[PDB]
Nucleic acid binder design. Structure first.
Ligand SMILES: [Mg+2]
Ligand SMILES: [Mg+2]
Length: 540
DNA sequence: ACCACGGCGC
DNA sequence: AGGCGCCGTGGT
């Protein structure tokens, strides 16, 4: 019943804190408190009081550690019931949600957050009793990873502001050309960013066929699915798509980046979240690195903005084909495993297995087919979309999917076994036992059920790839710290480091070894490494 | 400002 | 290929 004692707290208290805004690097610490045995201790001066703690334990511990690091304090994050909640069920992604689900309330008062953290931790710890695989993940991956991520977020990355000015101008110049042409074809200016105004132009004024409908507003859609089907019905459609692409790039990944350069540090502090996704993959925000375009040369132009400090270099490491390697491991398909053991081009081999021709006879269009099939099958691409993407009949798409499963029958078996297990147990799991609940496999609606089926056989693969990277980051960090090198960015299956140019080569060698050897699979883990003054130069 | 929403990236 | 972070719009 509310025992309130003075600051400082006994060792092993849980902390609660309130920030002026959600982003710790940019926030003022408004209040700080700790709780132990349900006894709450409120700090009189929060920043001063941070020096009394030896670690941050509690909800959003990593975020307090980032802010402490900004302030020159080494306050590592430790136990956090968010990590436990996320292990129990990855739909647990926010403190508000976790309190709602398991008891208590996420409020705006630091003492209450401290008390909540303590009770939630005990509760969730009990709920994990006997779950040895999740507990292994907590101890070997999640808790130690949180300290790595704190350092990554607090360190940040240098941007090339002169380059971004030049890129901005170039893109602005092309947007203006496209804009003028859309208006010339429409016969009058209008707001190209307004889908409502664009709907009226395309379908009422120009009279084009309206295929699809919006999802909730019930109007004629102007989505790329519609426009693609009309790219010939009128030249304005192609210009709209080009304009949309550039404006999305500019407004998302050019215009906002310089404003994200911190006044104190001179660096951009991408935020990393380890309890955000269905699969266990790390997420980033401000900016979201995952959605920098990867197909287009546009994406490359953004990566070029990320540069090393003067006298340093960036080292970029990528797990080549890790999703397919994991699929090979999980399915045990001996044909797929052989491709990788033999160190062969996986798409050329797939093509040559698929088509029963020698690898020398595989032409680029065949390799493109194999590549699309490889990932189509992984991601649950339909025959209809496959037929669009390769520009072949629908029946030929169907045949090509069946040819793949004939060649890789244990991949077919594994997908069906995985769906059966998910339907039986209500969840699927990764190699390490990270678990995702999949209730909608029972869904009545075809669309919703099929989405659940894709999640069911994607999560084991994606989440194994995720935890391999996360384990590798945990293993690598202490070794980099000792070389005076640092971890900066993680996205997809890639890790970006920064090191003094004198030690960049040795750092690369060390990181490649650690990542390739993180865990033994039925196939080799292969890491592509590059070194450069900017991220584009390092990963090309 | 707040919100839901279309649209789009992965 | 395939839940959500992101942008700008239009409503209040
Ligand atoms: Mg685009
Ligand atoms: Mg929405």
């Amino acid at each position: 019943a509310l025992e309130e004692a003075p600051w400082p707290p006994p060792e092993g208290a849980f902390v609660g804190f309130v920030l002026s805004r959600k982003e710790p690097m940019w926030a003022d610490l408004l209040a700080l408190a700790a709780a132990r045995g349900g006894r709450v201790h409120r700090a009189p001066e929060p920043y001063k009081a941070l020096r009394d703690l030896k670690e941050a334990r509690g909800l959003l511990a990593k975020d307090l550690s980032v802010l402490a690091l900004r302030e020159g304090l080494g306050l590592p994050p430790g136990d956090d019931p968010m990590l436990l909640a996320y292990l129990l069920d990855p739909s647990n992604t926010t403190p508000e949600g976790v309190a709602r689900r398991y008891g208590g309330e996420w409020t705006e008062e630091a003492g209450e957050r401290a008390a909540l953290s303590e009770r939630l931790f005990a509760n969730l710890w009990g709920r994990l009793e006997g779950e040895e695989r999740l507990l292994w993940l907590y101890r070997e991956v999640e808790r130690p990873l949180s300290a790595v991520l704190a350092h990554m977020e607090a360190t940040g990355v240098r941007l090339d502001v002169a380059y971004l000015r030049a890129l901005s101008l170039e893109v602005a110049e092309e947007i203006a050309r496209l804009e003028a042409e859309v208006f010339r074809l429409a016969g009058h200016p209008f707001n190209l960013n307004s889908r409502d105004q664009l709907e009226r132009v395309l379908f009422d004024e120009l009279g084009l066929p309206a295929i699809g409908k919006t999802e909730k507003t019930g109007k004629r859609s102007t989505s790329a699915a519609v426009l693609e089907a009309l790219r010939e019905a009128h030249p304005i459609v192609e210009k709209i798509l080009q304009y949309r692409e550039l404006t999305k790039l500019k407004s998302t990944y050019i215009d906002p980046l310089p404003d994200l350069i911190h006044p104190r540090t001179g660096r951009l502090h991408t935020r990393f979240n380890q309890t955000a996704t269905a699969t266990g993959r790390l997420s980033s925000s401000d900016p979201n690195l995952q959605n920098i375009p990867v197909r287009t040369p546009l994406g490359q132009r953004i990566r070029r903005a990320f540069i090393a400090e003067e006298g340093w270099l960036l080292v970029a490491l990528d797990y080549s084909q890790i999703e397919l390697r994991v699929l090979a491991h999980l399915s045990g398909d001996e044909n797929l495993i052989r491709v990788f053991q033999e160190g062969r081009d996986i798409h050329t081999e797939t093509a040559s297995w698929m088509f029963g021709v020698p690898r020398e006879a595989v032409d680029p269009l065949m390799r493109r087919a194999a590549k699309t099939i490889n990932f189509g099958v992984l991601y649950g691409m339909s025959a209809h979309r496959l037929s669009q993407e390769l520009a072949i009949p629908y029946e030929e798409a169907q045949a090509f999917i069946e040819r793949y499963f004939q060649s890789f029958p244990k991949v077919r078996a594994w997908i069906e076994k995985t769906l059966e297990e998910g339907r039986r147990r209500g969840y699927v799991e990764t190699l390490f036992g990270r678990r995702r609940y999949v209730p909608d496999l029972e869904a009545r609606v075809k669309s919703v059920r099929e989405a659940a089926e894709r999640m069911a056989f994607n999560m084991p693969v994606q989440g194994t790839a995720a935890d391999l990277m996360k384990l590798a980051m945990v293993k690598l960090f202490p070794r980099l710290e000792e070389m005076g090198a640092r971890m900066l960015l993680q996205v997809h299956d890639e890790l970006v480091l920064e090191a003094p140019k004198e030690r960049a080569e040795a750092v690369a060698r060390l990181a490649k070894e650690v990542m390739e050897g993180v865990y033994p699979l039925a196939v080799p883990l292969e890491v592509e490494v590059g070194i450069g003054e900017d991220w584009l130069s390092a990963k090309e």
